[PDB]
Design a protein around this ligand. Sequence first.
Ligand SMILES: Cc1ncsc1-c1ccc(CNC(=O)[C@@H]2C[C@@H](O)CN2C(=O)[C@@H](NC(=O)C2(F)CC2)C(C)(C)C)c(OCCCN2CCC(c3ccc4c(c3)n(C3CCCC3)c3nc(=O)c5c(Br)cccc5n43)CC2)c1
Lengths: 104, 149, 113, 92
Amino acid sequence: MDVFLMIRRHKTTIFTDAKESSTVFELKRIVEGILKRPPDEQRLYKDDQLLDDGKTLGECGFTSQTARPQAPATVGLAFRADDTFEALCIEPFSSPPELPDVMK
Amino acid sequence: PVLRSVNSREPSQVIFCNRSPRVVLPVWLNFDGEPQPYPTLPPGTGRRIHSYRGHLWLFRDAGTHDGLLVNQTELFVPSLNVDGQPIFANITLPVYTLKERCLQVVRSLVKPENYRRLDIVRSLYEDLEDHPNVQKDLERLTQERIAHQ
Amino acid sequence: PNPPKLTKQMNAIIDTVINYKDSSGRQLSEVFIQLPSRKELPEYYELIRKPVDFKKIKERIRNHKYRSLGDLEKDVMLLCHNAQTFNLEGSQIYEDSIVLQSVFKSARQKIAK
Amino acid sequence: MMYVKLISSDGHEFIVKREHALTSGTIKAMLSGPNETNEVNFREIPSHVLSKVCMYFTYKVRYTNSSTEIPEFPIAPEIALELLMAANFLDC
Ligand SMILES: Cc1ncsc1-c1ccc(CNC(=O)[C@@H]2C[C@@H](O)CN2C(=O)[C@@H](NC(=O)C2(F)CC2)C(C)(C)C)c(OCCCN2CCC(c3ccc4c(c3)n(C3CCCC3)c3nc(=O)c5c(Br)cccc5n43)CC2)c1
């Protein structure tokens, strides 16, 4: 079973796939290869809750039904900044404009 | 005509299986290659139907005429019925291009008369107005089949 | 109820017409066996005042509605004229009704001999 | 796997598999001629639109050549025009 994820920190979003049976640590290893930060320098979140390294993605709540390619599940990412883990921060995307009148 | 049903007398049972979120219009190509619309299939339904070996079928969205796939291709032809079994015609959505998918959504939200009131690049008006049509798709498929032969 | 010889003749003529196969081996009567439903083709019932098909004709022989070969002929002639009225000249179905009309005439002559 | 960085008009960075981004001929053309090696900047594509484009690359890669019921690619009315403009530019 494949899970489709959005790993988000500030103004950065990683679009990646993973196995439901794969662990949080393996996902931290994917983040390392891209953002050059070891797993211990990372904190992963499913909304407000901090995810443990050993737990599988399916255990966290990432299933095929919720982590879809056309609608990925958001995985929050926090880095250790100034010798301590920064507060979880994801900048919002832009807002769509007012819908046109002919589209209304 | 290149794309037409062969005048065969070999009966063929088919299951028209709608595995798409759309209302499906089955289209039978007659012996003179002219498209014939058949009763529509609501989403998530299947019907056991009577056809003939060598008969040509196409599948469209009933409301918009958007193109659909049948057994992962554009045309369906009833073939060999293995040990009595009906042939399965699995009707699905294609993986549309983002542009064609966007065109579909904009078409569902704007009346044709209002297309040119949208603030978009000039060629996109031409694409909006180039509505999906059975006859249009047939002409393209005719050329495609001729190039193979 | 009709005399047994009459019923045999009616069925023999109608079986000849229905089992008629052209040069290509195509059974011309096939589409004429059953009328299009009133739901699918209401125009047919708005245009054709006396609709009939080969199943209705078979049922009229069976229930002794035809008391002669003339009575049977009238219904076969009505089916063919209907086919010629609703459908365009040159269409396969229009052409098939012309041949079936001829096959009927020949089959009646053979049985009368 | 190689990764490319797609940057929205408002400075959002989207990291996608090189393969997914090459779905677009426009992206391919701007990864072979223009600040960094595999970074592309879109001066008029906003983050609410670019994010949907990346979802589309994923959807297309997963569902192309697959024996599965294909779901509809969803597009909210409010993002429909801007998504049409970008898909046109990108040729996707
Ligand atoms: C349920 C559902 N959900 C999704 S798809 C669906 C579905 C699926 C299947 C069916 C039934 N199956 C077919 O229609 C198949 C499919 C395709 O393979 C071609 N086909 C045929 O049967 C063709 N026949 C032959 O190839 C052979 F038999 C000679 C071998 C034929 C069209 C030319 C008849 C269905 O059928 C319902 C709609 C199909 N129409 C078929 C033609 C019918 C018909 C039947 C009798 C006619 C007639 C036309 N016309 C004309 C011709 C066209 C306009 C009206 C006509 N004029 C007459 O005057 C007349 C008379 Br005098 C007496 C009796 C019948 C007569 N008929 C009307 C229904 C619905």
